[PDB]
Symmetry: D2
Subunit: 425 residues, 4 copies
């Protein structure tokens, strides 16, 4: 039934037939022995699933084991929201187990926190830390700052010239002009204080702005493009080298994120009664403080850590992020956390605990949050999509939930380490 | 039909009946009137899918939106390998779109590389970087080191005693004693030179060893347990404060991983002819090196980066990790990368590129790699499971692939920044 | 010698053995003698002789000099328990062509080749038409740590400081304590119920440490009136950061942030520096950026800025302990000119902590070195321009030092 | 007369006055660089240089108060300094006794910062009344960290693996060790960054700081490496991997020079009467300043109050390289409760990269030697090579801790200005 190549190509270019009529082996035969290239399988074929299936068959014959894809599932998944948006050369999907850790008592509310992980004991441990938090009157958090950044590098012909652009940007008149250009690109675009830094005839300019409920990379980058266009009108010798000169900084470790913040800067806290630490966490307060100082402060310091003065906030950040359609690679900066434990109340037997996380890069609109399964997890928290009355509130709430769930996860791993657990039981 | 609470209880305490003979609403009426806790749902119910179903039903009526879970899938998924191994309190699974970039021409072989992401353009950009490497003759990698670590903190009564223990561990006979205890806990356990650091009466002890094709955390922790128990026979006043004093360092940014290594230290390289840089990357070598020097080195320096001297290593690392059953939270350390670009060839128009990644924390057995869909992705690369013939070969191969694919994504992203793109197109 | 009863009854009429024997049988306490003796130089001699009696080598103080020094400006100012002085050889590297001027730079060092090397660096810069420089920013900082009952309370204080009216009353309290106290933008960080506050201000030509400490004093007291439950834990919570390696000094700057640059003709790199522009760029990329990167350095992207900074600081009465942060520097080298064969060099030092008044700039030997550079004392027609000028000179002299050593390294020097 | 004075230059220089030599330079019969030799004495060669310099300054009376007479320039010329125009007096104060390891020390400190010696001295008083401090040198080994390039990263991987084999390190150790009597190479640490290779040589240097000695050994060791790997370019003797006089985490973790630890318990009475505070307030300030504060500031290795003050003061006093306080001041200061009722103050400073020596450099000069002799660590130690330098490093750590106790007590007592 697989027709000759010259004939199949005619039915393809037929506007009232298309690949809908061609068989699987015929679409394959045209990719092989080049005619339809390979990447162009996306736009031609009838349904999205049949494109995934064809691409899987092509892929199977190139592999050293033909049936590698047998347990990689692809059927019945909604690919309409994925193609052209979230992923390319799609051959299926990867199911990541999702557990629940809660209720999380935070700001006089309750939250059932979804967490997608394959590390056993992670969700149970976090769930225990939530119960301890809940039995001690609950947690409270504050968003200290909010604004996604982009950190382009431009080049003037000399360091003195880039010193002049730095001085001009620092004047209130220069900032008003660059803020007009930036703010015109979108209704959420509101440029805050510019931070600049020189390295010879390079000039790194840190544009920061809130992005409503989106994480905001696409919004700040568009705002930055036009802003540097307006700056170029005043300084035509300027050469834009890159929209990112790693000064944002995005998806790399960097002290500037730790010190200036990026996206949402958050602080959570709680006071656990001496009873709850004993019963739920199987330790004392004196022991928790001892482990936290010498592990999370002194230990991190001996390791040469910048922004890693914590136990495992990266476990909780990553688990929520995958569950809620966040950019999981932004875990690199979003895990930044200092966990602090001290005595509280009369005997100095109650455990004070606070996690401060300067650079939670998060958003409840765009990216993976347009997909329905990760919209479901966002809906658990009540933060799905945009907030009309109070733009930004949903992404800020989710940032607060991340910091609170980190603190829950911190209480439980630190408690296990304090009561002598060396291995995953 | 829904029977009273006491009738349902004695059916649940019956052996040749049990939970199979109750309806969902009856089990839920038992949980509401506090006869069965939430965590007891795992061991009472017959099937795992029915346990996930009933946990979802309770969860839904605690939420502000009772239909929020509608689009979080849960059915027809193999929870036999998840319950009590990878996740707890399971309410479903989050599907991450999976894409393929390849062939990745690495060490005279070809790799179809799975990439689970929700960020648009990442799989297509990475795939273009692969094309540039393929038409450039290919890439070559070496594994420079190998050994997962654990960095426990112990406490001596005084600093003079911690110094005594440090000197003892540095003697070849004291080290032999501890290497015997450590190696006895597993067939892969081979303890390497002990790196130690004192902070007052604290002593941080960095145990390092290979772990076959396992990532190594369970195996190193077990070897660390017995090793410290032997050290205590020689120094009984020693206090084992925590199995991790953040010296390892695991899932936090730390300079020690950058300088000493953790897991696999790997380097990848390639020469991209000027012709390939022109037709695939749409830019010149000269423009590309200018961006790399001033973004990936200088820019990263101004930012105060330790080990983040790259464009988006974290994008590629994270995507391969989710797809292949790795711990995504370990992208914090595993993303460590310095990207170098120089001029090669006749008139300095070719592009020598290399990515050095000293701390890739990876494996092909254990964790999420026991799950069949994550195994499907590992089979794409011919690195699933353990190697009987040559232990470590699979995990070393996946680490070489993570490095070469990072370099593919570096080429492509850096080309796009060089060519004047400031926004995703 | 006379007995010990005739001496208690002034101090000028007694001998050195007499006052010593009063403390050696416990007649008089030792914290009395500071004021008792008339001449300052005999206070030093006695303190030495008392100290000789405790050392296993009595005569080890023999070649530690002490005579013919002006101790009047030091005592109750720069040093205590003074037993003499330490001579540090001063050399001169110049002339240095910087912003249409020439500078003979004094360098107090005991390291061989350092002054000759820096001096060759100046020769290369001179023959390439000199160096240019700009002060990018200027503000000494101080970073107290305060605590409030909860993290929610300290968040409230942070928000309060970020409004214009909160910053206005804090600026009112800060500016009141001194002439030069003009408070710039505040920077804050929270860690739980901790709150770190970075007060930045110019301070005339002084380095400013004590001035900002006074400004921070009244400013925290004002914040205490707004927030009565605020414990003031310390005036320095290491957030300044003063005399320790910190990323915040590198990123925000501290004291003077300065940039400096030069082009060295291809001919000059060949004949004076004995290398090639290409090779210089190769060593700079791979040593000062890639190498420092591998070593895990924050702000140490240079060859030996600290050699030059420390030498000038000791000679010019600066606080040499501040070389920790002042040495922060990134040396960049690029190709330049029509044939791409000329060597563009630039050093960027974001945190040079410096001044030309107060501290050890009060001493006459140190003021001699400051006068060489034409920057001594307070600039009367532009308060703070002498301190700016010395910072600029440090950056240009640091760049000269980089040129020479990197040229040496590139020509295969494993010496000295 | 111009032409008359040239004829006398051959017979000498001492039969020409200062004004006659200077006229010979200003109308160029002789260049500027011919003063090191022709002028017969060191003090008078400095004098003519100052006169030549004085005319080029906008204020020609600039150098009147820079001293130069009656100083030993012979140990300075061609070893410690060049283009010498005088010396710079730094006041030396004294802080002691410092009770360290069953001994007493009077510690010299060259500083122009008010209250530093007086405060360092109060910290000694608290330590003395607490029953003395203790200390241990945990490591010793100056490093050099050169950079080399091979054609490929694969080739540099081949060299790293070779340098890790028992036999590769044996051939290298032997070449390094032959150049000096103290040259004894410990295990190598290598990091690759592409086709670059950063090799960290480490060896003790007797009582010398070791920069010259390990440079010699590194040079020789790389020439043996070049014989096994001819395509290897030697880029630079330092690829900043040592790392010398720059902030770098490799010194914090691996150490460089003397890694040292120090400790002491300070009784409750002593904290209240000498230091005017409590153990509980000191602990609170130390946690939140030296740990949390430094963490918030992005500190690598600077977990202390003012270690750099003490290190700089002693270094300049004792003829050390004061530039090297960049890394030698790396310190973590820890305070916790101690004793039966948690009222005594355990304190410890750990300083992993103290770069120190008692022979060579500024320790060849006599005033600097006087300060070393006070401590009893001057010059080489014939019986136990290295022991004078280890003792000075222990003194630096103990004195720093005295300095931490004092300043931290002042901050805890509520003093905001000095
Ligand atoms: C977070 C998971 C976890 C745990 C851990 O949390 N265990 C735990 C605690 C409590 C319960 C529990 C549940 C319900 C009722 C009662 C009790 C169950 C399990 C433990 C370890 N890990 C892995 C840490 C890993 O992902 C990062 C670390 O490596 C980071 C670091 O600290 O360095 C490692 C071994 C040490 C302690 C136990
Ligand atoms: C990697 C995705 C990506 C790309 C990008 O790679 N775009 C791209 C390039 C090539 C093709 C292509 C495909 C087939 C044939 C021919 C060409 C398609 C798309 C671009 C950007 N980003 C986001 C990076 C983001 O996750 C981390 C950065 O923020 C990290 C950083 O550099 O700071 C950011 C905007 C500027 C550049 C383009
Ligand atoms: C800075 C002094 C110095 C020099 C050095 O600068 N030598 C030099 C250069 C030029 C002339 C000269 C003068 C007039 C006419 C012609 C030529 C004379 C001597 C050299 C080295 N050092 C010690 C660096 C030391 O304090 C920091 C380093 O350890 C820092 C680092 O690079 O990592 C160390 C060995 C390498 C090469 C030469
Ligand atoms: C180090 C000197 C010093 C002191 C200080 O120590 N003062 C002091 C203490 C005790 C006595 C004394 C003497 C004999 C008997 C009884 C008591 C006298 C004076 C003080 C300050 N500084 C300057 C610190 C400066 O160089 C680094 C810091 O800026 C580094 C930092 O902490 O961030 C600064 C203001 C705060 C406290 C007082």
């Amino acid at each position: 039934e697989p027709r000759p190549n010259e004939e199949c190509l005619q039915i393809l270019g037929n506007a009232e037939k298309g690949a809908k009529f061609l068989s699987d082996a015929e679409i394959i035969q045209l990719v092989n022995a080049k005619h339809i290239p390979a990447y162009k399988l996306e736009t031609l074929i009838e349904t999205h699933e049949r494109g995934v299936s064809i691409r899987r068959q092509l892929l199977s014959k190139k592999l050293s084991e033909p049936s590698s894809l047998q347990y990689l599932p692809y059927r019945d998944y909604n690919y309409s929201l994925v193609m052209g948006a979230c992923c390319e050369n799609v051959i299926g999907y990867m199911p990541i187990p999702v557990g629940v850790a809660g209720p999380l008592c935070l700001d006089e509310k309750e939250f059932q926190v979804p967490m997608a992980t394959t590390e056993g004991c992670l969700v149970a441990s976090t769930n225990r830390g939530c119960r301890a938090i809940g039995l001690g009157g609950g947690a409270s958090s504050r968003v200290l700052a909010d604004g996604m950044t982009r950190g382009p590098v431009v080049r003037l012909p000399r360091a003195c010239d880039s010193a002049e652009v730095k001085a001009w940007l620092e004047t209130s008149e220069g900032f008003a002009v660059i803020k007009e250009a930036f703010d015109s690109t979108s209704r959420f675009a509101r440029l805050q204080k510019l931070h600049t830094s020189i390295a010879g005839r390079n000039l790194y300019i840190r544009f920061q702005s809130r992005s409503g409920d989106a994480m905001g990379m696409n919004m700040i980058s568009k705002g930055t493009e036009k802003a540097l266009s307006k700056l170029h009108e005043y300084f035509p010798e300027m050469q834009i080298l890159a929209v990112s000169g790693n000064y944002c900084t995005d998806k790399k470790p960097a002290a500037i994120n730790w010190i200036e913040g990026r996206g949402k800067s958050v602080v959570c806290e709680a006071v656990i009664p001496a009873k709850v630490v004993r019963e739920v966490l199987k330790t004392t307060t004196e022991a928790m403080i001892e482990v936290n100082i010498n592990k999370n402060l002194v230990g991190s310091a001996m390791a040469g850590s910048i922004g890693g003065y914590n136990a495992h906030a990266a476990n909780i950040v990553t688990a929520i992020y995958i569950a809620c359609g966040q950019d999981a690679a932004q875990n690199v900066g979003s895990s930044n956390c200092i966990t602090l434990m001290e005595a509280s109340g009369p005997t100095n037997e109650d455990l004070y605990i606070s996690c401060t996380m300067p650079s939670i890069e998060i958003g409840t609109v765009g990216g993976g949050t347009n997909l329905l399964p990760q919209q479901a997890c966002l809906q658990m928290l009540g933060v799905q999509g945009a907030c009309k009355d109070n733009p930004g509130e949903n992404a800020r709430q989710l940032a607060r939930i991340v910091c609170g769930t980190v603190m829950a996860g911190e209480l439980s791993l630190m408690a296990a380490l304090a009561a002598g657990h060396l291995v995953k039981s």
